[PDB]
Design a protein around this ligand. Structure first.
Ligand SMILES: Nc1ccn([C@H]2CC[C@@H](COP(=O)(O)OP(=O)(O)OP(=O)(O)O)O2)c(=O)n1
Ligand SMILES: [Mg+2]
Ligand SMILES: [Mg+2]
Length: 540
DNA sequence: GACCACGGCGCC
DNA sequence: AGGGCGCCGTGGTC
């Protein structure tokens, strides 16, 4: 019922747009529109009309901003109803769901999307009236962050395409040797990529013991954890596990990545989704650059393909024991706090016990393997699983889960306190007040209930760490532009920067200080920083 | 060509 | 039976 008015609209209008595809760096701006003051303005030519806007206000404001930056236009994203709804409830991840829940319908017409954005913002803003903690997260964190993420996506990252092309040819030959040996041992060829066909060969034909079942379908599992106990006694299992590793890296990273280079920027562009997680974390998609291999030596080779522009250097900064430090602040445990005040390393100490090796002989590989243990046990890891991963008896596993807790009596108390709030209020909170609704805390089925519990007390820890990182990105970004530096990637507790070689050292120091003193806790926040030509070298 | 579910697995 | 994600190939389908 809005009054149709000719383009352009006045400043402050809510924008509506339609893309040919979800990726703003690859999308064709099909239509553009705006709504304000009971009026709607439809653009005759979307691309030309994009120059008329001063800022992007409305649903998916960041995506339009990325496309604008792609066209060399300085169009910063502003108010976004998606961010408002996401703070009220992280379950609000899609424009279709948000519009349905908060008044309206997500259609495929720009004018209607513009009117929807204006209408959704008014209602959602009313929902936040009174929520001062959520409003603070919106004004001081989420909204300015959308501008930062827009620049990150539009900038992209340089990739050594020729290196990955040559690597693909080499790996393919290595894969052929493994699959050929598997088929020989099986006595017949089959689809090794098919876990169903593999299940028959291993358990029915070869008569191997089945120790685990799948979650949904309840089939005999062929996962790495299951095959691990079988790998040393049987050669074929060893071959499969090696086959799994090669094909995983080749089909997910080595092959698709080089084909995603933008023809105009010459770099690889990912998407940093701001409303996709239930804890407040960001996510990376199309392609996912938050899961680039780093553990295995072969996986490290892939990470070397991520390089800096000529004359530039990569700067990688990582928070040290971030969730363990957050836990000390939230729980207020005197003992755990003093641990960080003395400058101890839990990850190193745990690895010392796992491998029976002095603290001065613990390599990075050993230390990273202890992360799964420390974080695992912390968030309710069964004593059975730990004994299976460490190749140690179940009795030694029980003692470790135990010994992990008595040192800090407050941690147990914080968990139980957190769970009660979730059962009563219906949600749990981070340090800054970010919520997550966990209804299954009172489920009558124990497996479902206990699973919901583990989701419940993990959120304040993972979420707070996410809030700290987001706030750090907001403060650091303008400091990089003034130095001619770039913010490329975010990996939960890691920031990948690109700086000129004559300013790389200065950027590294500044970014480190910003991240460490973004929001002081009861324990000091430490950050490890490295500089290199590639991502792997940038992290020592 | 593409949706949906699943197992599986990469990272944090 | 640690938590949080996204993408792979397969299977079944449309
Ligand atoms: N297996 C893992 C690994 C990590 N995390 C969470 C905890 C911290 C956050 C970042 O991960 P890391 O940086 O790898 O762990 P860290 O404690 O920060 O160790 P480091 O000192 O090496 O950074 O992700 C987790 O839940 N489970
Ligand atoms: Mg870290
Ligand atoms: Mg990290």
């Amino acid at each position: 019922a809005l009054e149709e008015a000719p383009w352009p609209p006045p400043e402050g209008a809510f924008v509506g747009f339609v893309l040919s595809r979800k990726e703003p760096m690859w999308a064709d701006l099909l239509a553009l529109a705006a709504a304000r003051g009971g009026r709607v303005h439809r653009a005759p030519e979307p691309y030309k009309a994009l120059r008329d806007l001063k800022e992007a206000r409305g649903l998916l404001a960041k995506d339009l901003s990325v496309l604008a930056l792609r066209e060399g236009l300085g169009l910063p994203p502003g108010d976004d109803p998606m961010l408002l709804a996401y703070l009220l409830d992280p379950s609000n991840t899609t424009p279709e769901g948000v519009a349905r829940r908060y008044g309206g319908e997500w259609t495929e017409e720009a004018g209607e999307r513009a009117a929807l954005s204006e209408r959704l913002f008014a209602n959602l803003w009313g929902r936040l009236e009174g929520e001062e903690r959520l409003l603070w997260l919106y004004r001081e964190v989420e909204r300015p962050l959308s501008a930062v993420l827009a620049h990150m996506e539009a900038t992209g990252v340089r990739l050594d395409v020729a290196y990955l092309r040559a690597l693909s040819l080499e790996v393919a030959e290595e894969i052929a040797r493994l699959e050929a040996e598997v088929f020989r041992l099986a006595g017949h060829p089959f689809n090794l990529n098919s876990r169903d066909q593999l299940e028959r060969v291993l358990f029915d034909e070869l008569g191997l013991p089945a120790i685990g079942k799948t979650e949904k379908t309840g089939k005999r599992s062929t996962s790495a954890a299951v095959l691990e106990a079988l790998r040393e006694a049987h050669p074929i299992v060893e071959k499969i596990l090696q086959y799994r590793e090669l094909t995983k890296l080749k089909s997910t990273y080595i092959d698709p990545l080089p084909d995603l280079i933008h023809p105009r920027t010459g770099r690889l562009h990912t998407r940093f989704n701001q409303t996709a997680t239930a804890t407040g974390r960001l996510s990376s998609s199309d392609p996912n650059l938050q899961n680039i291999p780093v553990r295995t030596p072969l996986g490290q080779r892939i990470r070397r393909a991520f390089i800096a522009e000529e004359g530039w250097l990569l700067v990688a900064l990582d928070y040290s024991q971030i969730e363990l430090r957050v836990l000390a602040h939230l729980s207020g445990d005197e003992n755990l706090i003093r641990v960080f005040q003395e400058g101890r390393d839990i990850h190193t100490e745990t690895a010392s016990w796992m491998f029976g090796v002095p603290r001065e002989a613990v390599d990075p590989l050993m230390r990273r393997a202890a992360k799964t243990i420390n974080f695992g046990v912390l968030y309710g890891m069964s004593a059975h699983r730990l004994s299976q991963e460490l190749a140690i008896p179940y009795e030694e596993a029980q003692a470790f889960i135990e010994r992990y807790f008595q040192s800090f009596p407050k941690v147990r108390a914080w968990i139980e306190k957190t769970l009660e709030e979730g059962r009563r209020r219906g949600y749990v909170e981070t340090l800054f007040g970010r919520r997550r609704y966990v209804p299954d805390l009172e489920a009558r089925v124990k497996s479902v209930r206990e699973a919901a519990e583990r989701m419940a007390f993990n959120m304040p820890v993972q979420g707070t760490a996410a809030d700290l990182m987001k706030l750090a990105m907001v403060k650091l970004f303008p400091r990089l532009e003034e130095m001619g530096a770039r913010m490329l990637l975010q990996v939960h507790d890691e920031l990948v920067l690109e700086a000129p070689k004559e300013r790389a050292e200065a950027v590294a120091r500044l970014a480190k200080e910003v991240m460490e003193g973004v929001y002081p806790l009861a324990v000091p926040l430490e950050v490890e920083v490295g500089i290199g030509e590639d991502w792997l070298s940038a992290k020592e």
